[PDB]
Write an enzyme that holds these catalytic residues in place. Structure first.
Site, PDB file in Angstrom:
ATOM      1  N   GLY A 185       0.834  -1.191   0.000  1.00  0.00           N
ATOM      2  CA  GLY A 185       0.000   0.000   0.000  1.00  0.00           C
ATOM      3  C   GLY A 185       0.867   1.237   0.000  1.00  0.00           C
ATOM      4  O   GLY A 185       2.093   1.164   0.119  1.00  0.00           O
ATOM      5  N   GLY A 228       4.975   8.139   1.570  1.00  0.00           N
ATOM      6  CA  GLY A 228       5.535   6.840   1.872  1.00  0.00           C
ATOM      7  C   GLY A 228       4.813   5.719   1.162  1.00  0.00           C
ATOM      8  O   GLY A 228       3.696   5.884   0.660  1.00  0.00           O
ATOM      9  N   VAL A 283       4.380   1.220   1.534  1.00  0.00           N
ATOM     10  CA  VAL A 283       4.552   0.047   2.384  1.00  0.00           C
ATOM     11  C   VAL A 283       4.713  -1.177   1.496  1.00  0.00           C
ATOM     12  O   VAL A 283       3.902  -1.403   0.590  1.00  0.00           O
ATOM     13  CB  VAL A 283       3.375  -0.132   3.357  1.00  0.00           C
ATOM     14  CG1 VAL A 283       3.569  -1.393   4.176  1.00  0.00           C
ATOM     15  CG2 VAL A 283       3.253   1.079   4.266  1.00  0.00           C
ATOM     16  N   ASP A 318      -5.906   8.963  17.207  1.00  0.00           N
ATOM     17  CA  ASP A 318      -6.368   8.684  15.849  1.00  0.00           C
ATOM     18  C   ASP A 318      -6.753   7.212  15.716  1.00  0.00           C
ATOM     19  O   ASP A 318      -6.446   6.557  14.711  1.00  0.00           O
ATOM     20  CB  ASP A 318      -5.318   9.079  14.804  1.00  0.00           C
ATOM     21  CG  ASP A 318      -5.909   9.224  13.411  1.00  0.00           C
ATOM     22  OD1 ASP A 318      -7.127   9.479  13.300  1.00  0.00           O
ATOM     23  OD2 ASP A 318      -5.163   9.062  12.417  1.00  0.00           O
TER      24      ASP A 318
HETATM   25  C1  LIG Z   1      -1.131   4.732   6.686  1.00  0.00           C
HETATM   26  C2  LIG Z   1      -0.947   4.196   5.935  1.00  0.00           C
HETATM   27  C3  LIG Z   1      -0.617   3.340   4.697  1.00  0.00           C
HETATM   28  N1  LIG Z   1      -0.839   1.916   4.931  1.00  0.00           N
HETATM   29  C4  LIG Z   1      -0.766   1.230   3.646  1.00  0.00           C
HETATM   30  C5  LIG Z   1      -0.766  -0.253   3.854  1.00  0.00           C
HETATM   31  O1  LIG Z   1       0.156  -0.585   4.798  1.00  0.00           O
HETATM   32  C6  LIG Z   1      -0.313  -1.628   5.561  1.00  0.00           C
HETATM   33  N2  LIG Z   1       0.551  -1.802   6.729  1.00  0.00           N
HETATM   34  C7  LIG Z   1       1.098  -1.009   7.593  1.00  0.00           C
HETATM   35  N3  LIG Z   1       1.797  -1.697   8.422  1.00  0.00           N
HETATM   36  C8  LIG Z   1       1.707  -2.937   8.069  1.00  0.00           C
HETATM   37  C9  LIG Z   1       2.217  -4.043   8.545  1.00  0.00           C
HETATM   38  N4  LIG Z   1       2.968  -3.959   9.607  1.00  0.00           N
HETATM   39  N5  LIG Z   1       1.936  -5.225   7.939  1.00  0.00           N
HETATM   40  C10 LIG Z   1       1.190  -5.267   6.919  1.00  0.00           C
HETATM   41  N6  LIG Z   1       0.681  -4.151   6.439  1.00  0.00           N
HETATM   42  C11 LIG Z   1       0.951  -3.000   7.016  1.00  0.00           C
HETATM   43  C12 LIG Z   1      -1.775  -1.171   5.847  1.00  0.00           C
HETATM   44  O2  LIG Z   1      -2.633  -2.221   6.152  1.00  0.00           O
HETATM   45  C13 LIG Z   1      -2.093  -0.587   4.467  1.00  0.00           C
HETATM   46  O3  LIG Z   1      -2.578  -1.529   3.626  1.00  0.00           O
END
Ligand SMILES: C#CCNC[C@H]1O[C@@H](n2cnc3c(N)ncnc32)[C@H](O)[C@@H]1O
Length: 340
Positions: free
Chosen positions: A22, A27, A29, A139
């Protein structure tokens, strides 16, 4: 260096075989293979150094998560960045890989009462630790609740967190912007800066309601609409609760409204467990002084199968108690040094 559907992940030799998960405003991920621990992990790339507010959010996230250690709070396993401030343009936060989050899960999955109960217990167990550190998350919402494949729940994103400051909580009418709109307590729009622990309990109440029906309970269409939705369900505040609002603009706004009856929770949620609805009512209480606190919520009969105060730990060292972005970058660099 490897690049994912956007740009590079300078995550060194240790982390390989990256896969996009995502994105965000500054940023991205990805998942990645941890060649040392022989397991796939999550890696968040953060690029905040051009904006003071981004540096603030990033520092809070790092500082708080490095100090906390709790089963229901996401940990930071590693932080990757350049060896010098001059060369540091991005920061990568490495975390346990979680399968989904509660936002993504509620988009397609109905929760059994057993899952609602288990999730709520874990949220409050994590929140007890956070609040015991004198920290407010500020939040809480489904997308900040991560879930792994065995439905272990971890609270994440402390970028908007603050140290509790109840003596300085009062402010004027329609000024404040705490939390994400749908999860914002009524007093934020009335007279509160969101510096007391009751702000987080309101958000948990909103999350519980959403788990019961897969729809946000108070889906305000804009900042001003949010109070309409809350009062449309709770009904008009009592005289006693109004008498607790000394600010004249806030109180007079509420007095200007026509009388509204409460909508019973069991008509909104006819399949819900009655103990869940009793707890929901106590979390979604209008008066933040009468609102249930996290340790009371854990002791509520709905959670009786899980409640165990000796297994609901608190923080060893609470947090006891402006800066240009250049100072903030320095602090982020200092805070991440332990991983070099
Ligand atoms: C805020 C923000 C952006 N998040 C984008 C993606 O990152 C995912 N995310 C963040 N931390 C983790 C994580 N630790 N494991 C898996 N997905 C993660 C979240 O579910 C989302 O789909």
């Amino acid at each position: 260096p490897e690049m994912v559907r956007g740009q590079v992940f300078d995550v060194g030799p240790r982390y390989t075989n990256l896969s996009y998960i995502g994105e965000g405003a500054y940023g991205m991920v990805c998942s990645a293979y941890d060649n040392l621990n022989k397991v796939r992990v999550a890696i968040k790339k953060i690029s905040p150094f051009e904006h003071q507010t981004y540096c603030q959010r990033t520092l809070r996230e790092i500082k708080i998560l490095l100090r906390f250690r709790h089963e229901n709070i996401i940990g930071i396993n590693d932080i990757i960045r350049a060896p010098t401030i001059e060369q540091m343009k991005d920061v990568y936060i490495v975390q346990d890989l979680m399968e989904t989050d509660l936002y993504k899960l509620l988009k397609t999955q109905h929760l059994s009462n057993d899952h609602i109960c288990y999730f709520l217990y874990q949220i409050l167990r994590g929140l007890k630790y956070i609040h015991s550190a004198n920290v407010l998350h500020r939040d809480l919402k489904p997308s900040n609740l991560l879930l792994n494949t065995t439905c272990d729940l971890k609270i994440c994103d402390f970028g908007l967190a603050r140290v509790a400051d109840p003596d300085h909580d009062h402010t004027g009418f329609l000024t404040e912007y705490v939390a994400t709109r749908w999860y914002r307590a009524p007093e934020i729009m009335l007279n509160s800066k969101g510096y007391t622990k009751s702000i987080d309990i309101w958000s948990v109440g909103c999350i519980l309601a959403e788990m019961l029906s897969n729809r946000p309970i108070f889906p305000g269409k804009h900042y001003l609409d949010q109070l309409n939705h809350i009062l449309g369900i709770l009904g008009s505040p009592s005289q006693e609760d109004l008498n607790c609002i000394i600010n004249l603009k806030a109180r007079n706004y509420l007095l200007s409204l026509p009388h509204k009856n409460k909508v019973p929770w069991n008509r909104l949620f006819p399949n819900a467990d009655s103990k869940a609805l009793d707890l929901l009512d106590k979390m979604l209480t209008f008066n933040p002084h009468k609102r249930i606190e996290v340790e009371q919520a854990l002791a509520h009969p709905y959670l009786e199968q899980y409640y165990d105060p000796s297994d609901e730990p608190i923080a060893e060292a609470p947090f006891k108690f402006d800066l240009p972005k250049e100072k903030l970058k320095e602090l982020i660099f200092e805070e991440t040094a332990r991983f070099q």
